[PDB]
UniProtKB/Swiss-Prot annotation, chain B:
Chain's role: Part of a cation efflux system that mediates resistance to copper and silver.
Native organism: Escherichia coli (strain K12)
Further details from the record: The cus system plays an important role in copper tolerance under anaerobic growth and, under extreme copper stress, in aerobic growth.
The family this protein is said to belong to: Belongs to the resistance-nodulation-cell division (RND) (TC 2.A.6) family.
Transmembrane segments: 38-58, 65-85
Protein name: Cation efflux system protein CusA
Subunit text: The cus efflux system is composed of CusA, CusB, CusC and CusF.
Length: 44, 96, 139
């Protein structure tokens, strides 16, 4: 299953390239605007 | 160690027995791991090592959670390169 | 995420490496001064043949053998919960990316003195291999 899926993406080649490019910037945007706190509120 | 006894040296084993031929199929599946292995353990311990030094706010809970992995990632590799092999060379003999 | 980075690189390299010795055989079986963009296209996409599933399912392992942690109830659960989440998202990320981009990125772009200290003790482990398994249980 895994091997066949490798050939799919390799075929995609370019279209995937800009997919991980635009997702990289989008991802860079989320982190810039992400809230922050010491720990994850653990109060009952 | 499986595809080593699944390549061309795996044409001699299934048909007849040859200790010094299955030993060669293991000695190559041993130098072929040397490169990927030694670096896998490296980058896993290297990228895990900074959080083992508990200085700063929060380091306390991260060092407690990295030491088991870091310390557990020295006996896991070191030993598995001798226990896994010398155990597969023993199971392959049972079914045979 | 801190622990996630330790494996996200283990996804790329273990694949890249199995492609480094695959380009060290086609170079030994064929000439040397002749290679095209397609001739280099086949040798690296053939390292995705063996270790391909080996890592996607192993990084699927790292993530799932960890799931049982989410069953932490209350204070403890709210704590290491988000740590498991981010650790899992980032693993399924560098795993689902190591099967879509990592192969392409590596195609678009003293090992001696450690091998000599290992195999003296490796051929030694093949001495009554049931003796080293006796030493193991003692560990």
């Amino acid at each position: 299953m895994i091997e066949w899926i490798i050939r799919r993406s390799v075929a995609n080649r370019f279209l995937v390239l800009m997919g991980a490019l635009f997702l990289s910037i989008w991802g860079t945007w989320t982190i810039i605007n992400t809230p922050v706190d010491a720990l994850p509120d653990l109060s009952d | 160690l499986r595809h080593a006894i699944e390549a061309v040296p795996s044409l001699n084993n299934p048909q007849t027995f040859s200790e010094q031929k299955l030993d060669e199929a293991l000695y190559h599946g041993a130098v072929l791991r040397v490169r990927p292995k030694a670096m896998t353990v490296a980058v896993i311990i290297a990228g895990l090592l900074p959080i083992l030094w508990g200085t700063g706010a929060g380091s306390e809970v991260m060092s407690r959670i990295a030491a088991p992995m870091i310390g557990g990632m020295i006996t896991a590799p070191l030993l598995s390169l001798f226990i896994i092999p010398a155990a597969y060379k023993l199971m392959w003999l049972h079914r045979h | 995420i801190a622990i996630a980075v330790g494996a996200m690189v283990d996804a790329a390299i273990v694949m890249i490496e199995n492609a480094h010795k695959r380009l060290e055989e086609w170079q030994h079986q064929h000439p040397d001064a002749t290679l095209d963009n397609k001739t280099r296209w086949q040798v690296i996409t053939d390292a995705s043949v063996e270790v391909g599933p080996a890592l996607f399912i192993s990084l699927l392992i790292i993530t799932l053998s960890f799931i049982p942690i989410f069953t932490l109830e209350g204070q403890e659960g709210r704590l290491f919960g988000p740590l498991a989440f981010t650790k899992t998202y980032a693993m399924a990320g560098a795993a689902l990316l190591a099967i879509v981009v990592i192969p392409i990125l590596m195609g678009y772009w003293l090992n001696r003195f450690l091998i000599r200290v290992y195999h003296p003790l490796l051929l030694k482990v093949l001495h009554w291999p049931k003796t080293t398994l006796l030493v193991a249980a003692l560990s």
